[PDB]
Amino acid sequence: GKFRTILIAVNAYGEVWEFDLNKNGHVIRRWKDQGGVGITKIQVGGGTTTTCPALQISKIKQNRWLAVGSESGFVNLYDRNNAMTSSTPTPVAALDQLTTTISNLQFSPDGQILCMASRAVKDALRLVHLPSCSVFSNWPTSGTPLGKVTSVAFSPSGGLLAVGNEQGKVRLWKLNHY
Amino acid sequence: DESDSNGDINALTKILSTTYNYKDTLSNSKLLPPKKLDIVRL
Amino acid sequence: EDEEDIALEFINGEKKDKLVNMNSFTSMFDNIQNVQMDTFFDRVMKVLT
Amino acid sequence: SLAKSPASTIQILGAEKALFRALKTKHDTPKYGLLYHASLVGQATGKNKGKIARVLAAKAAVSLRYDALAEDRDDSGDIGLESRAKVENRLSQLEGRDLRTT
Amino acid sequence: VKQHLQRETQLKQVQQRMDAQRELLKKGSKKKIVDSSGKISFKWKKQRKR
Amino acid sequence: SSLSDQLAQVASNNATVALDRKRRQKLHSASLIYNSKTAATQDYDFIFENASKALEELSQIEPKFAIFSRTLFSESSISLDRNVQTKEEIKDLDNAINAYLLLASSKWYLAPTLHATEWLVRRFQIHVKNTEMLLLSTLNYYQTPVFKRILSIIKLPPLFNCLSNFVRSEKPPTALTMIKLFNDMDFLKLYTSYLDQCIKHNATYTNQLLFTTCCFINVVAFNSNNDEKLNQLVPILLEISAKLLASKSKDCQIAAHTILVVFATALPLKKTIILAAMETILSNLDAKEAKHSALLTICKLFQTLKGQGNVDQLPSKIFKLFDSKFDTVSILTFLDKEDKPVCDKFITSYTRSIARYDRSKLNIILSLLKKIRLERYEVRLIITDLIYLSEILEDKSQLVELFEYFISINEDLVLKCLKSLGL
Amino acid sequence: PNPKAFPLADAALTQQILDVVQQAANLRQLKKGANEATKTLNRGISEFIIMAADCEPIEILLHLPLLCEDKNVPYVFVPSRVALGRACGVSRPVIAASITTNDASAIKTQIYAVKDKIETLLI
């Protein structure tokens, strides 16, 4: 029955603050992302979070994967266990298959799949296997009616991935391993 | 000629003579193989 | 605790494996001249790792 | 001065004559100059000799400079040695790329 | 000396405009805008070339 | 079918019967060391006397050419023709050639060897009648002018179209082209036939083994895309692995170690396959370099092994055999080595087998745990097994110390296990 | 961190730089890499010079400030080469870069403000 919320905020330049919220807002820890000049989005995944919100305080876990998606198209993937304990960390991997501006970082509830998606051009989404930190290479091909993706949503249990593009349509895919 | 009637050496030969599928299936090991998705559009 | 939580612990305790990709072996065709095959095995191991 | 100059020069530094003639009459520039007799190029073969001349020239710029200015020198040729490793690798991989069909 | 320097600036302009044309040729996702005094210019979409 | 088709068929059959003076000049001119004009002038007597001398020096250097001197280089072997002896004799003589080529594949860096095979090539027309085995045996040599000459001479059988476009080039073929070659499959089948023959004659060596294993490695490399093709390429490389294991040469077993590690890391396999592989590797493990290499390979095999029960107890006979080959001292030495290759799943299955089987080397168990770092789930599994042994086996101070170690390090998971089962 | 580059910016001035260079390269008025900066400096077209204070070794661009001193052009360092790369808009570490001259840019005011800042620091 005891936990704590840690806000993790990110100024564009590449400086990441980490406040807690139980006690009124103090700066628990501050560090500099390696590189990442134009930084636009941040997400965490693997435990529980606002994308896989748990059910009861017994179901709350501690999160493992940190993603910093930055404007030129880059993603730096971070392992919490040693990023926090080094306090000037090193990226665990860099994903730059994408080429345009980064808009959506999300994870599957497990934290096994990192879904990244840009927003400046059609066909701009890819999924990444973790902890390999390797982009998948049989999806999505040139016959995937994606369109300009703007919102990335997994579902908690069923295993669906719903992706929503600009032309006004979401689309479903179901993953089988789930 | 033939007559069929401490570690051996023919274990591999025999087991590959038996099995018909090597990229395992029965598992569903609650883990996701790299570089290949099992995805169905809906 | 619960069975899905065990599975989550399984995923968490899983660690990453440096995979193989189609052109990660030519340097041995390069240094295949007169080197000891034990050293060759060492080479393949460290190319994987 | 020699480290003061950039890479493309150290590539082209010999055949400045043909270079300037090509420039002032719009033909196509030379490529080797003095670094011909470098042993690396001396095993390269043709268009490969050109590409290896280019890459070797760049690495030569790096090594030249580091030997030239560094306040604290080991005199052991470490940068040059690893550079030679680099260009050796680039060479043999380029060589292995054959251009025909099989 | 005076005609040196003026020929110099003229050639600078020629070279600058001609490299603008080269860039026009090379690669990317260009955009042509007619700036207010009536002068053409080109802007590239935000895109990291691989 | 076309008339010219059938006639081309007949020519391919009859390409060697020195029908006419012109075709005799051509055939007899095709040869290795000499240039064409001389290779047309000179005579059988010259060739043979020099060749017999070459056999003499080669038998001096390696004494097992002697029977070849007995038969393949007799004054009769001057007299005899090939193109009229009957088919039984032909299969006989081909068997003899295969023996000679197997042996001679090892010493190609010698002008005497060059001259001996020259006599063969101009007298028996090996460069048209036993090309498959000739090229295979010499294949590990492809930067050298000897491979140049031999390629240039020989009409290449359909399985070598790469070299066919390389016939009389200026520069040696490249490993990229050779890897295309081996990436073809039926050629691999032929190569495996060749290596089985070579192993069963037990005349293998460093250059050939290194080359061929690197080639298989790059085959699974370029095949890593379409898991199907691997789903059908598994057998070939596994049987060659086993047959290399069959040898008594530590080189062969560690080559098998290599090919296994690469194939296993390039495909997710079945636990049964993996454990059988480890079993045979161990069963023919003899040398100490082989010991070290096999340890690394087994560790990697388990670590890449993924599925339900990745930490199951090692089967009985397998476990006893493994302990017999590697008593615990070797294991602790490899572990406290500073390389630290991830081997925790192997460690854990080892410990579970020890507890379920031995029940005595618990202090070795705790030492291993104090020596290597583990992960939560298998820690829970080991603790659960220890709880079983506490509830069944008589209480042991070593078991108590194990629980104490867990209490010092991660008592709370122990508490969770107790609440799952017990007070 | 390297005691060899003398003028090294802060986080604020680093931010200002890396922004101006984004918009510059977005126009393609920026030239990349140490060799090309060297060319431009000798061309006398180099508006000014950014360097990366985390290139190993550092000499391989340490040479340039010689040219900069000689030709009276501003030069600054920024502390992260991967930053400078993903800023200027390529796929690699970029130890150096230089902004060129074009009065028809929509960015003259920014470029002079920044070079005012770097002059302020350097002097």
mmCIF file of N, CA and C in Angstrom, chain E residues 24 30-43, chain G residues 27 104 106:
data_model
loop_
_atom_site.group_PDB
_atom_site.id
_atom_site.type_symbol
_atom_site.label_atom_id
_atom_site.label_comp_id
_atom_site.label_asym_id
_atom_site.label_seq_id
_atom_site.Cartn_x
_atom_site.Cartn_y
_atom_site.Cartn_z
ATOM 1 N N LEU E 24 20.012 23.668 -55.352
ATOM 2 C CA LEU E 24 18.744 23.387 -55.993
ATOM 3 C C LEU E 24 18.721 22.020 -56.622
ATOM 4 N N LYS E 30 12.367 20.388 -51.464
ATOM 5 C CA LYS E 30 12.502 21.825 -51.591
ATOM 6 C C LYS E 30 11.158 22.514 -51.478
ATOM 7 N N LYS E 31 11.207 23.837 -51.388
ATOM 8 C CA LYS E 31 10.017 24.672 -51.423
ATOM 9 C C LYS E 31 10.403 26.041 -51.953
ATOM 10 N N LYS E 32 9.605 26.554 -52.887
ATOM 11 C CA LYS E 32 9.887 27.793 -53.610
ATOM 12 C C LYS E 32 8.980 28.886 -53.078
ATOM 13 N N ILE E 33 9.558 29.913 -52.501
ATOM 14 C CA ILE E 33 8.750 31.013 -51.990
ATOM 15 C C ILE E 33 9.183 32.316 -52.643
ATOM 16 N N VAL E 34 8.195 33.142 -52.973
ATOM 17 C CA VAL E 34 8.414 34.457 -53.563
ATOM 18 C C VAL E 34 8.407 35.476 -52.435
ATOM 19 N N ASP E 35 9.597 35.860 -51.983
ATOM 20 C CA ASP E 35 9.731 36.779 -50.866
ATOM 21 C C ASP E 35 9.306 38.181 -51.270
ATOM 22 N N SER E 36 8.836 38.938 -50.272
ATOM 23 C CA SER E 36 7.953 40.087 -50.426
ATOM 24 C C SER E 36 8.433 41.102 -51.446
ATOM 25 N N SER E 37 9.723 41.420 -51.472
ATOM 26 C CA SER E 37 10.211 42.347 -52.483
ATOM 27 C C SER E 37 10.173 41.732 -53.876
ATOM 28 N N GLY E 38 9.762 40.475 -53.990
ATOM 29 C CA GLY E 38 9.631 39.816 -55.268
ATOM 30 C C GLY E 38 10.793 38.937 -55.656
ATOM 31 N N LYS E 39 11.467 38.308 -54.697
ATOM 32 C CA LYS E 39 12.689 37.563 -54.981
ATOM 33 C C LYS E 39 12.531 36.107 -54.577
ATOM 34 N N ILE E 40 12.963 35.205 -55.441
ATOM 35 C CA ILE E 40 12.730 33.791 -55.189
ATOM 36 C C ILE E 40 13.676 33.316 -54.103
ATOM 37 N N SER E 41 13.270 32.271 -53.397
ATOM 38 C CA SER E 41 14.151 31.599 -52.460
ATOM 39 C C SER E 41 13.641 30.190 -52.226
ATOM 40 N N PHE E 42 14.487 29.372 -51.625
ATOM 41 C CA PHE E 42 14.165 27.974 -51.428
ATOM 42 C C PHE E 42 14.403 27.575 -49.985
ATOM 43 N N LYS E 43 13.461 26.811 -49.448
ATOM 44 C CA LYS E 43 13.522 26.327 -48.076
ATOM 45 C C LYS E 43 13.280 24.831 -48.091
ATOM 46 N N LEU G 27 18.272 25.861 -44.132
ATOM 47 C CA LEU G 27 18.426 26.604 -45.377
ATOM 48 C C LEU G 27 19.565 26.106 -46.249
ATOM 49 N N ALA G 104 21.026 37.374 -48.298
ATOM 50 C CA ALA G 104 19.633 37.190 -48.685
ATOM 51 C C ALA G 104 18.923 36.201 -47.773
ATOM 52 N N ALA G 106 16.920 34.845 -44.494
ATOM 53 C CA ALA G 106 15.982 35.368 -43.519
ATOM 54 C C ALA G 106 16.522 35.270 -42.096
#
